[PDB]
Tab-separated table of C-alpha atoms and ligand atoms in Angstrom:
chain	number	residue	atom	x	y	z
A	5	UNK	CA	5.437	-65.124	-27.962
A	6	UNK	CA	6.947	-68.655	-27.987
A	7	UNK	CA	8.466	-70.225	-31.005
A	8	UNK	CA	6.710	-73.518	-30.554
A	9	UNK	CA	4.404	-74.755	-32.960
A	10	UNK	CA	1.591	-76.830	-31.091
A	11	UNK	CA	1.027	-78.877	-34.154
A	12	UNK	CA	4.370	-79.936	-34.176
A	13	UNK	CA	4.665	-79.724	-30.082
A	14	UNK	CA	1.193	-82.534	-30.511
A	15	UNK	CA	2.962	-84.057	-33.478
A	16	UNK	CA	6.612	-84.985	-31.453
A	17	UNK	CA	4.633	-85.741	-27.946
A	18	UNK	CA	2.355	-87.998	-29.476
A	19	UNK	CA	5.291	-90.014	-31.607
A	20	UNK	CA	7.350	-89.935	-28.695
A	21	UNK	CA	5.189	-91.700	-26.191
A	22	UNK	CA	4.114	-94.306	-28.619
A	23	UNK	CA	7.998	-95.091	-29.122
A	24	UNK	CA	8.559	-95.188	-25.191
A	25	UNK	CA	5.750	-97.570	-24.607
A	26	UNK	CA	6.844	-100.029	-27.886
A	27	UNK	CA	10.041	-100.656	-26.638
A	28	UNK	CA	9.747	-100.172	-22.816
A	29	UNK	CA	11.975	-97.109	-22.588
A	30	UNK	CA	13.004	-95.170	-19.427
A	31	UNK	CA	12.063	-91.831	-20.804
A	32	UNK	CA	12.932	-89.964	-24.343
A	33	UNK	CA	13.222	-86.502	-25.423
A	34	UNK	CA	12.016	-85.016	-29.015
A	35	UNK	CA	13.574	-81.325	-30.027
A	36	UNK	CA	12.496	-79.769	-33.422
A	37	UNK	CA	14.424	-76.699	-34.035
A	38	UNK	CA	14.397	-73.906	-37.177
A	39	UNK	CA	17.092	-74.966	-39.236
A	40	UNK	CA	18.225	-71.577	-40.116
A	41	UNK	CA	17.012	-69.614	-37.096
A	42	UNK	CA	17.365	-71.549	-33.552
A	43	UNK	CA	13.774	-70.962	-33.122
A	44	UNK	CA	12.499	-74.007	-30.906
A	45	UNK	CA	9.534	-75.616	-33.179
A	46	UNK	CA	8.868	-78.217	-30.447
A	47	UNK	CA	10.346	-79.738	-27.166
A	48	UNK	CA	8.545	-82.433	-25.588
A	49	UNK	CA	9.971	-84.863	-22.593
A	50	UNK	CA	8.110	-88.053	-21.178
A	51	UNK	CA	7.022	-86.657	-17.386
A	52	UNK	CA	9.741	-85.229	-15.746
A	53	UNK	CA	12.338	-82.299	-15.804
A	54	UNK	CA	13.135	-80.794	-18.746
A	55	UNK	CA	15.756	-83.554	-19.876
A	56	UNK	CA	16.613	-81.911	-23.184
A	57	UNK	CA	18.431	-79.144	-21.649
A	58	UNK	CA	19.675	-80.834	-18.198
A	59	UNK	CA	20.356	-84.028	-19.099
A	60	UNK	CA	23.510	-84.812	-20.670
A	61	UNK	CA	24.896	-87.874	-22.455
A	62	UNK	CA	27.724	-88.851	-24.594
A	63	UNK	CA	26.373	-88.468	-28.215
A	64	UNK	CA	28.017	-91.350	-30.078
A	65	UNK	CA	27.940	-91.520	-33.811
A	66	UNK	CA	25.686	-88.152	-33.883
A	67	UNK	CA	28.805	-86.395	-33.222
A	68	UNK	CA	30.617	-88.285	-36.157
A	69	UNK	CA	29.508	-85.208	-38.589
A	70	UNK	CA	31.229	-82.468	-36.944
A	71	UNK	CA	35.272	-84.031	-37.426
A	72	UNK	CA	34.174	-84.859	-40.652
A	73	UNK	CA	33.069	-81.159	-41.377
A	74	UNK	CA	36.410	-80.131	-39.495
A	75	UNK	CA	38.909	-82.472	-41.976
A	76	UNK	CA	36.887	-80.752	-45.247
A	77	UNK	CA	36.982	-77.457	-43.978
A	78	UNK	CA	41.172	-77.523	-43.161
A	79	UNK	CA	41.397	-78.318	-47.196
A	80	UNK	CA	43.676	-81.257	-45.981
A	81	UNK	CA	40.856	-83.956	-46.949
A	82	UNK	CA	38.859	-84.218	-49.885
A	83	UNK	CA	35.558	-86.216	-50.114
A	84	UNK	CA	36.804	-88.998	-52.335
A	85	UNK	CA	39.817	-89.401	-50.140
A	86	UNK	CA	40.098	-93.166	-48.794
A	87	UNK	CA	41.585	-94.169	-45.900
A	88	UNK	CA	42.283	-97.351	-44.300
A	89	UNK	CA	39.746	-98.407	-41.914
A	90	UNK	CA	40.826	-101.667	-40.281
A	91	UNK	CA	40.788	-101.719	-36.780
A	92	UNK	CA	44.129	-100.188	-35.205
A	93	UNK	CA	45.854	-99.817	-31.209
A	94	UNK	CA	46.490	-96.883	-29.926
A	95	UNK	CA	49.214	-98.138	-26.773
A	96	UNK	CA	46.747	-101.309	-25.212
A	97	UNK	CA	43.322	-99.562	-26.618
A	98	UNK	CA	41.477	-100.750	-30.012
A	99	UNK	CA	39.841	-98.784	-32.143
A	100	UNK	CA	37.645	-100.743	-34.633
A	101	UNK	CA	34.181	-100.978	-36.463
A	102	UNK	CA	30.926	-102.444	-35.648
A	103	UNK	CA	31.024	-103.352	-39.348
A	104	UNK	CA	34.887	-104.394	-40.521
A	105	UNK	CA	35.404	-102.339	-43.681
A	106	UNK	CA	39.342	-102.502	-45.441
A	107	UNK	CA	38.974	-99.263	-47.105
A	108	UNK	CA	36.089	-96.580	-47.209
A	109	UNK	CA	36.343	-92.531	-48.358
A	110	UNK	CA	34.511	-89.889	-46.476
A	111	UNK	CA	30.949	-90.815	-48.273
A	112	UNK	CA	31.531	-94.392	-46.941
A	113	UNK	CA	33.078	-93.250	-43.779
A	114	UNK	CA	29.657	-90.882	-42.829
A	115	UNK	CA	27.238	-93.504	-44.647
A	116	UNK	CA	28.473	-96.450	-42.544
A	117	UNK	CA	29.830	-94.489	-39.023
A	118	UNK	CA	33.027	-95.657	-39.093
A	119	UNK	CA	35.042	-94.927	-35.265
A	120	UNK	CA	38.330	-95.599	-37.419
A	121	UNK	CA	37.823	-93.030	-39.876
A	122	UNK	CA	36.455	-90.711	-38.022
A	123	UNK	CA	39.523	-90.894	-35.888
A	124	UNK	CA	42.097	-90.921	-38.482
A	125	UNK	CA	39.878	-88.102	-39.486
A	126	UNK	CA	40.345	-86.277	-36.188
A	127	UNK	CA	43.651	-87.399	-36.280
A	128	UNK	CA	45.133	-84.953	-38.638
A	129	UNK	CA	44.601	-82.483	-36.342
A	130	UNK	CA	46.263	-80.956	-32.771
A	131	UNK	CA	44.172	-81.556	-29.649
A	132	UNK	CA	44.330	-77.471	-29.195
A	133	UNK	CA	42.808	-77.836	-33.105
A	134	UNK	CA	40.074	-80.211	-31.830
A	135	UNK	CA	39.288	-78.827	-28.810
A	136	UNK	CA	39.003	-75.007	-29.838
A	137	UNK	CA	36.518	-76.849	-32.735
A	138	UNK	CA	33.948	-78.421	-30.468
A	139	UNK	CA	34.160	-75.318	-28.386
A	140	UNK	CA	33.124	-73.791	-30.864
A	141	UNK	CA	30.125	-75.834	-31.653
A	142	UNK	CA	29.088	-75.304	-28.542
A	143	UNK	CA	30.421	-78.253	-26.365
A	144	UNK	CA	30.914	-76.966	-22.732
A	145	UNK	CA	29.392	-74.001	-23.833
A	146	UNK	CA	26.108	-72.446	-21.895
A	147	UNK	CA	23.805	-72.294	-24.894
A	148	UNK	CA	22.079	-69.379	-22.461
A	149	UNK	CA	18.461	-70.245	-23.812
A	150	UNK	CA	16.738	-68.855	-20.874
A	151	UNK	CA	15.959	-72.359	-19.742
A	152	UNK	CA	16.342	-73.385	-15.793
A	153	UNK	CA	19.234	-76.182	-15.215
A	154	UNK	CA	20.948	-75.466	-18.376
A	155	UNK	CA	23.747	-78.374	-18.671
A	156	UNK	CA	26.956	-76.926	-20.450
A	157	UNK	CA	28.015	-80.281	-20.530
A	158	UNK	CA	31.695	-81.563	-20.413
A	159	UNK	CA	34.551	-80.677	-22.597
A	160	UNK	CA	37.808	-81.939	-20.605
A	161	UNK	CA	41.096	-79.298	-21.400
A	162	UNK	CA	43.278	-80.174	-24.617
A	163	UNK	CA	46.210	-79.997	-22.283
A	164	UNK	CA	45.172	-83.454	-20.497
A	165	UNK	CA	43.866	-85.353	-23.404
A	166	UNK	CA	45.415	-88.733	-24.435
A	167	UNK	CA	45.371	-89.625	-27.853
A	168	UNK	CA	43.119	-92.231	-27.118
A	169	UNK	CA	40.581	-89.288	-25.764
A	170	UNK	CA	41.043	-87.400	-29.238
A	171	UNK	CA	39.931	-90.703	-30.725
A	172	UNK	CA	37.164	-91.226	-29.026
A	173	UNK	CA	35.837	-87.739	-28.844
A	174	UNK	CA	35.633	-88.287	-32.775
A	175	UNK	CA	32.942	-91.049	-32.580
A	176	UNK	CA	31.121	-89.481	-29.634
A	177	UNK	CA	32.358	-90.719	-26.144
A	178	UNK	CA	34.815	-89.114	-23.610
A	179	UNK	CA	32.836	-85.751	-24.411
A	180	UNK	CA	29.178	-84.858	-23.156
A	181	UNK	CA	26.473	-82.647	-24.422
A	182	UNK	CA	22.840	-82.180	-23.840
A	183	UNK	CA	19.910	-83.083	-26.527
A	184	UNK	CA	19.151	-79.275	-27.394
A	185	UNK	CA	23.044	-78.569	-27.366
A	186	UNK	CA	22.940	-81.127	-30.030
A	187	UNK	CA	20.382	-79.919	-31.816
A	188	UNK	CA	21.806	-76.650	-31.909
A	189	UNK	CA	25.399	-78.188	-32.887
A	190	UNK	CA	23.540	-79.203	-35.944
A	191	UNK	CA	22.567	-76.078	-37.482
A	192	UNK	CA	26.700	-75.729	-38.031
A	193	UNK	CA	25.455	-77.846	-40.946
A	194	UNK	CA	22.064	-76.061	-41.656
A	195	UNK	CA	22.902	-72.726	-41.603
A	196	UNK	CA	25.896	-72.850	-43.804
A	197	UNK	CA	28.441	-72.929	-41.549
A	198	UNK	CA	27.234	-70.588	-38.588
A	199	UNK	CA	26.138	-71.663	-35.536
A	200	UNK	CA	22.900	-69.736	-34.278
A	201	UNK	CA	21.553	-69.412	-31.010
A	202	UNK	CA	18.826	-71.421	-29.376
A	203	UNK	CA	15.103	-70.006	-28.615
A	204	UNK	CA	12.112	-70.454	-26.889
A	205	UNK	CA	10.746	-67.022	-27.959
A	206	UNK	CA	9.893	-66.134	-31.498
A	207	UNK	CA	12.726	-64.074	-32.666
A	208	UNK	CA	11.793	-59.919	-34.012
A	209	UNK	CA	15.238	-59.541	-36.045
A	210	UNK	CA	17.709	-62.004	-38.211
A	211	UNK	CA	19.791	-64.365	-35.280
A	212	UNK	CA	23.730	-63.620	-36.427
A	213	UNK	CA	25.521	-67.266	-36.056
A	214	UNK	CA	29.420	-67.509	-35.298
A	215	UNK	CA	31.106	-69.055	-38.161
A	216	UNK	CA	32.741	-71.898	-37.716
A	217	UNK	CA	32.725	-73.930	-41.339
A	218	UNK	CA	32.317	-72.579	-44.901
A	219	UNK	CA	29.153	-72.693	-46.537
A	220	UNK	CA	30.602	-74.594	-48.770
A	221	UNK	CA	31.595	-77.150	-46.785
A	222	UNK	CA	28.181	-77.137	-44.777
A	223	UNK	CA	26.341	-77.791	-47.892
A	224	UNK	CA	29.143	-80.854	-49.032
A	225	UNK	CA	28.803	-82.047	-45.625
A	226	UNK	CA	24.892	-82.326	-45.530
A	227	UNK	CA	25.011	-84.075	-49.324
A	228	UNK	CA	27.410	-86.832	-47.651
A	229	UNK	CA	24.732	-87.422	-44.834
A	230	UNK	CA	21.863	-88.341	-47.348
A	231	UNK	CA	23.533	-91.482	-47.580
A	232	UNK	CA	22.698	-92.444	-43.997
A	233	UNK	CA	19.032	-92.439	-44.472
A	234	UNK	CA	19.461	-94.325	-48.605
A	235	UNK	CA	19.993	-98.329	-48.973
A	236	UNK	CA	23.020	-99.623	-47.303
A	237	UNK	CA	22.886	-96.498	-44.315
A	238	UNK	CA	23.311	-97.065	-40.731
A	239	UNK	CA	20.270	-94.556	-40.616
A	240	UNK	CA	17.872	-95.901	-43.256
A	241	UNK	CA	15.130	-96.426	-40.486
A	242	UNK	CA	14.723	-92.633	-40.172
A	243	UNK	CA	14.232	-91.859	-44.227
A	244	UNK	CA	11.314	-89.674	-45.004
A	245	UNK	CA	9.196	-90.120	-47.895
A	246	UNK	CA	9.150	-87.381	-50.449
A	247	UNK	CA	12.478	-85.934	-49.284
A	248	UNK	CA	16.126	-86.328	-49.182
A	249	UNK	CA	17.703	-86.571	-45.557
A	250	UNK	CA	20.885	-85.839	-43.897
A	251	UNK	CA	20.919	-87.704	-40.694
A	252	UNK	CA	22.809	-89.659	-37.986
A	253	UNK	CA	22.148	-92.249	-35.300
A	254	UNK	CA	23.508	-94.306	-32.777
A	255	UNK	CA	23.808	-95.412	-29.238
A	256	UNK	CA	25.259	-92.465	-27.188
A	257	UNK	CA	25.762	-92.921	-23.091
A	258	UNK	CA	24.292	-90.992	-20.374
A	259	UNK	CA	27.018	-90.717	-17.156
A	260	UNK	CA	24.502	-88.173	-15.431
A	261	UNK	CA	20.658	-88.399	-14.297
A	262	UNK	CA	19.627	-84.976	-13.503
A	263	UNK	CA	22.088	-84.031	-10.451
A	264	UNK	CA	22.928	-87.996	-9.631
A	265	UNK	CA	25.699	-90.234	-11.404
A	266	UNK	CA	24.063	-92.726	-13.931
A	267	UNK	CA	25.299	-95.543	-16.388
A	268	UNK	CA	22.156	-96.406	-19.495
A	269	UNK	CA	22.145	-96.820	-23.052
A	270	UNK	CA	20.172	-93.895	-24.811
A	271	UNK	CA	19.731	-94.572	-28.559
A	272	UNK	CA	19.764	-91.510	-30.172
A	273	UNK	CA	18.651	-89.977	-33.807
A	274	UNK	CA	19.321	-86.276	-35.419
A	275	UNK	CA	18.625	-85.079	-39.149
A	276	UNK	CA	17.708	-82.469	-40.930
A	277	UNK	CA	15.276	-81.975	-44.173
A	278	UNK	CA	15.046	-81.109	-47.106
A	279	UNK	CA	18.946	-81.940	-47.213
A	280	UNK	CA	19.628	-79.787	-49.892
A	281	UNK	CA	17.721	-76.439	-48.259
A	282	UNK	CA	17.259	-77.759	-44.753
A	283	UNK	CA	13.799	-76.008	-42.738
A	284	UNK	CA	13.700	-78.066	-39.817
A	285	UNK	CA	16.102	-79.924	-36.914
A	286	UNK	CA	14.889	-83.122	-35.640
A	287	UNK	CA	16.631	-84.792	-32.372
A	288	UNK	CA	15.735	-87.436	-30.527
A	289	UNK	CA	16.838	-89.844	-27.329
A	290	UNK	CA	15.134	-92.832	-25.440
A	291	UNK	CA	16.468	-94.149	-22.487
A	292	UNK	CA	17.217	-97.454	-22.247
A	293	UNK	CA	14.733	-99.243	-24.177
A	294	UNK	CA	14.029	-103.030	-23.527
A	295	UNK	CA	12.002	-104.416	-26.339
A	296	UNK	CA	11.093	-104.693	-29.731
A	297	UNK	CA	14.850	-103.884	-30.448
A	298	UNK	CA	17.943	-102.799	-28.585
A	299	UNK	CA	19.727	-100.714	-31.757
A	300	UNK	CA	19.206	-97.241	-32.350
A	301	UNK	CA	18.256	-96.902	-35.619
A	302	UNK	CA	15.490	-98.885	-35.263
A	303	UNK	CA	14.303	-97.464	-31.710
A	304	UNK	CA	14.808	-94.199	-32.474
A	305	UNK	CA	14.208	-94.300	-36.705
A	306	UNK	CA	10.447	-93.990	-36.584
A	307	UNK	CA	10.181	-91.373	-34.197
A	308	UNK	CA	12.473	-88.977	-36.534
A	309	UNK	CA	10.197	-90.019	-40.162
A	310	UNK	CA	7.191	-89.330	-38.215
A	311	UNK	CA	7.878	-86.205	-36.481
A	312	UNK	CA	10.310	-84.378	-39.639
A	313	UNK	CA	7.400	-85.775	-42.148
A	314	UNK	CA	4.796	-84.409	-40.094
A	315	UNK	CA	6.832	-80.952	-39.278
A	316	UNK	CA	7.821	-80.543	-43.302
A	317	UNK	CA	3.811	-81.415	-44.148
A	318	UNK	CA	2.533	-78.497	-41.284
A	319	UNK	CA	5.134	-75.936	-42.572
A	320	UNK	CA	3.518	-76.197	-46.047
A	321	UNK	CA	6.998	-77.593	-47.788
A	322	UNK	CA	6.865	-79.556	-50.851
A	323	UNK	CA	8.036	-82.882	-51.126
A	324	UNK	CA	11.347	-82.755	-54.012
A	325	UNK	CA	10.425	-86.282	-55.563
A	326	UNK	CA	7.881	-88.405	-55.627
A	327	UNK	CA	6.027	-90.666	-52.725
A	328	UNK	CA	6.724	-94.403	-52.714
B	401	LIG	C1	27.704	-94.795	-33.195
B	401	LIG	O1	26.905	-94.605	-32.292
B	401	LIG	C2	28.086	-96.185	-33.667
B	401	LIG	N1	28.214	-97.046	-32.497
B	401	LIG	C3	29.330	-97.715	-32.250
B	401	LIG	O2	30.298	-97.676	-32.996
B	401	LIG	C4	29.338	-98.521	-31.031
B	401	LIG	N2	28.544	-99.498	-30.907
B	401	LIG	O3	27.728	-99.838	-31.808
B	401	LIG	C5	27.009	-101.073	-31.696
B	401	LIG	C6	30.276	-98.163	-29.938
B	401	LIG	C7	31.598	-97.767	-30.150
B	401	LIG	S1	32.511	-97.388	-28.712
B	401	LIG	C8	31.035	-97.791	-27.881
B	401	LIG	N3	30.966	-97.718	-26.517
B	401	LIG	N4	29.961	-98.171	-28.615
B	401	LIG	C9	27.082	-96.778	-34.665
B	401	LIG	N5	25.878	-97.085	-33.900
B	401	LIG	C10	25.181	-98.149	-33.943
B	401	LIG	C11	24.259	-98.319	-32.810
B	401	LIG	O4	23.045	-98.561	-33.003
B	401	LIG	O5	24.710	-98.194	-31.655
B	401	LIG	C12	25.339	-99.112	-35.059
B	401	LIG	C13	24.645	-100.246	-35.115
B	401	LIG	C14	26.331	-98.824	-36.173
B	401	LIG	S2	27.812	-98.193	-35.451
C-alpha cells in the first residue's frame, strides 16, 4: 500500500495551485513526509514530471540548519556563542548579509539566516569535514526511493573546493539537491539525529536511520529554529497556529530543468511541527513567481501554515497552546 494520505495529498494540491496562480509561478512542488519514519504523507507537482525527485536546485538558506547542527555536534560551538557577523572577503569575493548585523550567536544566526555566520560556522571545519557531512545527509546521494529519474544531485569533491565554495555551500549555493532529498535531509533534525530513508510504500517494520548528529543536538537544533517562524524571524510567514515551528526559507536557484540547463529563482520553505516532538515534514518550492511578492517567505509562507496545519489537524494531534 502507499504511504500517502489523500487528505493530505487533496490538502497540499489544493494549497499549492492556489499559491501558483496568486503569484504567477512557473510551477511548485509540495512534499509532506513522516517525521520519524520517511513515509511520504503527500507529493503533489503542478502538471508535469515528477519535479520533487528530478528536479534539482540550489537550496539557499534551507540548508543553513545542517552547518549549524555540524558546529554543535563537534562540541567546538555552543549556542550562546557570538560571532562577528559583518560582512568579510574571502581573496576578491564578499560574503555579507541581506540584513547587516555586528554581532549575533547561533539563536540569532538561525533566526535571522545569516551567510556570515553560517560560514564562519562552516569555517571551523576541513573541507574533507564538510564534505563527508553533507554526504552524509544525503547530498549526491541516490535516496533509492523507487522513483523514475531520481536526481542525486551535485556534491563537487573536497579536493577541488575553494574556500569561497566551503562558504557558500554553508548558506546553500555551489551545492544542489532535489525537493524530496531535502525533505529527507530534514529528518537529521526530526528523528534525533538519524537520517531515515524515503518511501512511497507504507513501511511493515521500524526504518533504521544512519546517525549522523546526537539526539541531543537534533533536539537543541530544532528549539533554535522556532525562532524563524516567532516575531522578528525571516520565516514568520509560515507560523502555524496552535503550535511551535522549526522552519527555514529562502530563495534557492535551480541550474537544471529536467534534462536541459536552466537559470530561475525558486523560493523555497521547509519546517517541521510540533517542534518539540516533530510528526510531520513540510517542503515546498515555486518557480519563479511574478506577483503579489518576489521574497520567499511570503510566496512560499502560506503554503507551509496551510498544508502542516491541515496535516497536524488530519493526524488527530493536539495543538500545545492556545489559538490566536
Ligand atoms: C537564504 O536563502 C537567504 N538569502 C540570501 O541570503 C540571499 N538573498 O536574499 C535576498 C542570497 C545570498 S547569495 C544569493 N545568491 N542570494 C535569506 N533569504 C531571503 C530570501 O527571501 O531570499 C531573505 C529575505 C533573508 S536572507
Amino acid at each position: 500500500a502507499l504511504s500517502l494520505d489523500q487528505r493530505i495529498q487533496t490538502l497540499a494540491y489544493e494549497e499549492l495551485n492556489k499559491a501558483v496562480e496568486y503569484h504567477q509561478a512557473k510551477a511548485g512542488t509540495v512534499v509532506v513526509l513522516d517525521a520519524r519514519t520517511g513515509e511520504i504523507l503527500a507529493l503533489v507537482n503542478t502538471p508535469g514530471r515528477n519535479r520533487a525527485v528530478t528536479d534539482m536546485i540550489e537550496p539557499g538558506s534551507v540548508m543553513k540548519p545542517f552547518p549549524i547542527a555540524k558546529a554543535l555536534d563537534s562540541g567546538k560551538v555552543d549556542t550562546t556563542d557570538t560571532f562577528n557577523t559583518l560582512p568579510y572577503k574571502i581573496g576578491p569575493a564578499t560574503v555579507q548579509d541581506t540584513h547587516v548585523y555586528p554581532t549575533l550567536d547561533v539563536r540569532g544566526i538561525m533566526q535571522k539566516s545569516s551567510n556570515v555566520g553560517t560560514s564562519k560556522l562552516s569555517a571551523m571545519f576541513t573541507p574533507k569535514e564538510m564534505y563527508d557531512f553533507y554526504h552524509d545527509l544525503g547530498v549526491g546521494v541516490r535516496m533509492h526511493s523507487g522513483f523514475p529519474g531520481e536526481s542525486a544531485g551535485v556534491l563537487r569533491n573536497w579536493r577541488k573546493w575553494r574556500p569561497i565554495e566551503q562558504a557558500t555551500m554553508s548558506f546553500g549555493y555551489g551545492l544542489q539537491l532535489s525537493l524530496l532529498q531535502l525533505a529527507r535531509a530534514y529528518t537529521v533534525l526530526t528523528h534525533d539525529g538519524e537520517l531515515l530513508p524515503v518511501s512511497f510504500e507504507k513501511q511493515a517494520v521500524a526504518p533504521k536511520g544512519k546517525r549522523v548528529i546526537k539526539a541531543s543536538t537534533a533536539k537543541k537544533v530544532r528549539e533554535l529554529m522556532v525562532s524563524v517562524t516567532e516575531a522578528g524571524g525571516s520565516g514568520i510567514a509560515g507560523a502555524v497556529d496552535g503550535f511551535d515551528v522549526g522552519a527555514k526559507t529562502g530563495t534557492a536557484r535551480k541550474l537544471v530543468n529536467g534534462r536541459y540547463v536552466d537559470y530561475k529563482h525558486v523560493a523555497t520553505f521547509i519546517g517541521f511541527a510540533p517542534a518539540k516532538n516533530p510528526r510531520v515534514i513540510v517542503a515546498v518550492t515555486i518557480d519563479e513567481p511574478t506577483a503579489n511578492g518576489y521574497y520567499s517567505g511570503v510566496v512560499t509562507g502560506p503554503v507551509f501554515k496551510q498544508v502542516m496545519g491541515g496535516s497536524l489537524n488530519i493526524l488527530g494531534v493536539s495543538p500545545t497552546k492556545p489559538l490566536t
